[PDB]
Amino acid sequence: WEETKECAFTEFFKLAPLASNPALSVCQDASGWQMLPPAGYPTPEQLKLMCGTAECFTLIDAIKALNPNDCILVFGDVRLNVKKLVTEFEPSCF
Ligand code: NI
Structure with a gap:
């Protein structure tokens, strides 16, 4: 993965639909993350x-x-790589 190059600022706006996703607050509240x-x-x-x-x-x-x-x-x-985070999450649970 990319470990140095920073995202363009627009990357934040890519996250906007999560605000309409009910899994967002369930996951955050349950885990504290x-x-x-x-x-x-995490x-x-x-x-x-x-x-x-x-x-x-789901999130x-x-x-x-x-x-x-x-x-x-x-x-x-x-600092995090979101692409790395989401790709590696499921194996991280195992
Ligand atoms: Ni790498």
Whole structure:
């Protein structure tokens, strides 16, 4: 994956449909991990809760559906590659 190159700022606007996705607040509330605003990669306890929550799978797939680019999303001191995150999530649960 791309580990250095930053996303264009428009990458944030690509995330807009998640605000109309009911899986968003279910996953965030259940796990404590936030996509909006981005908290970055899940912490270990977060990931454990996400992997046991159906709606988190739904959300991650929803994010996949947005065609995230292979770049680093920067939000203050938060840095993550969303494309990497969503692609590696399911195996990360196993
Ligand atoms: Ni790489």
